């Protein structure tokens, strides 16, 4: 049993998690550490994860008038800015208004 945090992945034994930006590809063995490969194009993971697939970045729909503040990394999502003429509807940032 047991398992130290940010490592805690336990299945017969204690494996480590994936650093944010990496996703799981193979479990660990009695004598092999976890797999983890870095998140693909358009994808990210901000957690020490035991996840198969990363998530797609936020988008920022221009049909709703959204710019991009920070183009997301494999570690952080895309920071969704609002139009350079329009104010954001709610504390970052789904609907935009005048």
């Amino acid at each position: 049993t047991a398992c130290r945090e940010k490592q805690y992945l336990i299945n017969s034994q204690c494996c480590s998690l994936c650093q944010p930006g990496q996703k799981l590809v193979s479990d660990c063995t009695e004598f092999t550490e976890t797999e983890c490969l870095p998140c693909g194009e358009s994808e990210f993971l901000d957690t020490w994860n035991r996840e198969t697939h990363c998530h797609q970045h936020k988008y920022c729909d221009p049909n709703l008038g959204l710019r991009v503040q920070q183009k997301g990394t494999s570690e952080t999502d895309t920071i969704c800015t609002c139009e350079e003429g329009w104010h954001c509807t709610s504390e970052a940032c789904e609907s935009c208004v005048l």
Partner: antibody, heavy 122, light 108 residues
Amino acid sequence: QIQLVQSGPELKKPGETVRISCKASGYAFTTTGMQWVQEMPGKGLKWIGWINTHSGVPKYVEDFKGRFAFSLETSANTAYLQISNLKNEDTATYFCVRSGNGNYDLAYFAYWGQGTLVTVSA
Amino acid sequence: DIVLTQSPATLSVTPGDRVSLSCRASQSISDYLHWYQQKSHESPRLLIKYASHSISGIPSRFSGSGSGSDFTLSINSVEPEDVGIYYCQHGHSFPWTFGGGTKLEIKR
């Protein structure tokens, strides 16, 4: 190394059933979930779905769901796949697949069985 | 359901050549693409995982590239043994689909 040995070739009349075995060896059977693939004579490959070698919970791809079914005998390191109400369209070669190393999704099939040809005929 | 279009359907190549077998998805499948080699009277063999990553035992020649919608399996110096059918398969969302196959025909 890791090995996937399958059952012999079967012939069944349409509307009957058939079960194909898969005897995994070279690893901890319950650590890695078992999957199944259907190779159509000549034609392409279709992923049937997968089973959890720990919980026993299967995820079947829609077309295959209802007629195809994953069953396993842990004690023997053997996973099975049984096709119910056999259709003529089911005459294909069946493969049990493994990998990655977890009991999750993982589309990369690093380990394949030898194949089991099912023949649906009167 | 994703659609993995593998063109050319067939490809006749002399040995030693550089080869580039293509795979294009309907949606963007990010880096969830895998490559399989199926020789005659043999089960498939995983060559490439997650579009670019090398498989333990696969000859040096084979290498893969690509992201999102267009991917490419490249055989550096085509050998007469590399005669088979090559499949691409995705991971980015249930269910998983394979491709056409690109039959590789060695010239002599």
